[PDB]
């Protein structure tokens, strides 16, 4: 197996800047005066897309800002000027020797202006109460950078267990992230307490964003 | 325009079997070398098997980790690639992509789950805002306790795409959960109906849930 190691694991590049991603092969990949090295882009939720072949040649319709270079052991992918749609994972892939082998991948984040989330709080649905569960949800939407804290309170008292958080891959258009936070309880434990708050701390916002409901206010 | 569609993924128990297949149009199939690649979080992207063209004796090659367990083959008349998978293991779990012209072209992928666990369909609960701004309004659909992956979730059958954020599934108590959120104006909702549609093809579930407001 000719093993590929990519570096870095991930970077974060401002708009109209250079993004350089490198690939390191444990044996040479040149064959018949041509370098057998290809590059792939994988956007969120999608298969890998072919970008570059023969180290430096261009796939059809593949934008001019993508270009690769190298020989023998060391290859690189160069994106410049970077744009919002270039937020993806990039793989290098080798095709001289069987097995054909993929790098582990390199994540490109695109840097933009800081942007505060939009917090929305959702009780259990009526349907969910009939079921004998209680999932309180908080959507923290359209923020940058990715690093965000959420803090749940039940009657003001803090709660840590039950809470699972899921972030989206960076948006291809507006370069933001979103997250959901999901405190999940029993009907029994939910209905004991009344005031349910989800509290979002984030780099942009000076005081934390509080969002809450009381269980009966309607 | 070139198209590759994989089918035959789904749930099956260790040691069992499954036949994935791949429908290919838009390129001269008889000439094309075809392959299967698979993707999982642990192992990354793994080339699984190759099959060359009629000119090259339909030569097969495999990853040493699936030799004599998987078998790749094709019907140049039907333009179709098959992967017979026998004595399936937990590590074989992943998304299987069918590729054409080695890795020029790639299908969307079919998901294979090799687990002794049982299918368990989602419960799909709709989330309306708190009783009581206006300039915009954010609705939610919560999809809980399903297995295997994947599910698919859309709003108004693909109509509402802009302003949506569907969150990657997480394992909550050995079984998957996810949610989606959609943001519109108050002229749109509740004037017009916003329906969260969920599918879970392993259990055969397809349910359309209307975002009804909370009324006291």
């Amino acid at each position: 197996d000719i093993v590929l190691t990519q570096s870095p694991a991930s970077l974060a590049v401002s708009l109209g800047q250079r993004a350089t991603i490198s690939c390191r092969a444990s044996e040479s990949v040149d064959n018949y005066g041509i370098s057998s090295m290809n590059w792939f882009q994988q956007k969120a939720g999608q298969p890998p897309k072919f970008l570059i072949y023969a180290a430096s040649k261009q796939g059809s319709g593949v934008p001019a800002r993508f270009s690769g270079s190298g020989s023998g052991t060391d290859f690189s992918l160069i994106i410049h000027p970077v744009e919002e749609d270039d937020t993806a994972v990039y793989f290098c892939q080798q095709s001289k020797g069987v097995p054909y082998t993929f790098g582990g991948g390199t994540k490109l984040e695109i840097k933009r202006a800081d942007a505060a989330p939009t917090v929305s709080i959702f009780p259990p649905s009526s349907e969910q109460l009939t079921s004998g569960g209680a999932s309180v949800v908080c959507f923290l939407n359209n923020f940058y950078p990715k690093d965000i804290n959420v803090k749940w309170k039940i009657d003001g008292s803090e709660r840590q267990n039950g809470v699972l958080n899921s972030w989206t891959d960076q948006d291809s258009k507006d370069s933001t992230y979103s997250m959901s936070s999901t405190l999940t309880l029993t009907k029994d434990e939910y209905e004991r307490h009344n005031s349910y708050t989800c509290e979002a701390t984030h780099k942009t916002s000076t005081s934390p964003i509080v969002k809450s409901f009381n269980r009966n206010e309607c | 325009e070139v198209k590759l569609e994989e089918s035959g993924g789904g749930l099956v128990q260790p040691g069992g079997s499954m036949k994935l297949s791949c429908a290919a149009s838009g390129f001269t199939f008889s000439d094309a070398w075809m392959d299967w690649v698979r993707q999982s979080p642990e192992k990354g992207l793994e080339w699984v098997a190759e099959i060359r063209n009629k000119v090259n004796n339909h030569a097969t090659n495999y990853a040493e980790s699936v030799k004599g367990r998987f078998t790749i083959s094709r019907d140049d008349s039907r333009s179709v690639v098959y992967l017979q998978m026998n004595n399936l293991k937990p590590e074989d779990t992943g998304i299987y992509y069918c590729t054409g012209l080695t890795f020029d072209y790639w299908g969307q992928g079919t998901t294979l789950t090799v687990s002794s666990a049982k299918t368990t369909a989602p419960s799909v609960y709709p989330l309306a805002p708190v009783c009581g701004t206006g300039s915009s309004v954010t609705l939610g659909c919560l999809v809980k306790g399903y297995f295997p992956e994947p599910v698919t979730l859309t709003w108004n059958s693909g109509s509402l795409s802009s302003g949506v954020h569907t969150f990657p599934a997480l394992l909550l108590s050995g079984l998957y959960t996810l949610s989606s959120s959609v943001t519109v104006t108050s002229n749109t909702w509740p004037s017009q109906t916003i329906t969260c549609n969920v599918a879970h093809p392993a259990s055969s579930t397809k349910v359309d849930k209307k975002i009804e407001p909370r009324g006291p």
Partner: peptide, 14 residues
């Protein structure tokens, strides 16, 4: 020669 069935990403032939 050209590749074709091999693909622009496939291994090279003499």
């Amino acid at each position: 020669g050209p590749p074709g069935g091999r693909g622009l990403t496939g291994p090279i032939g003499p």
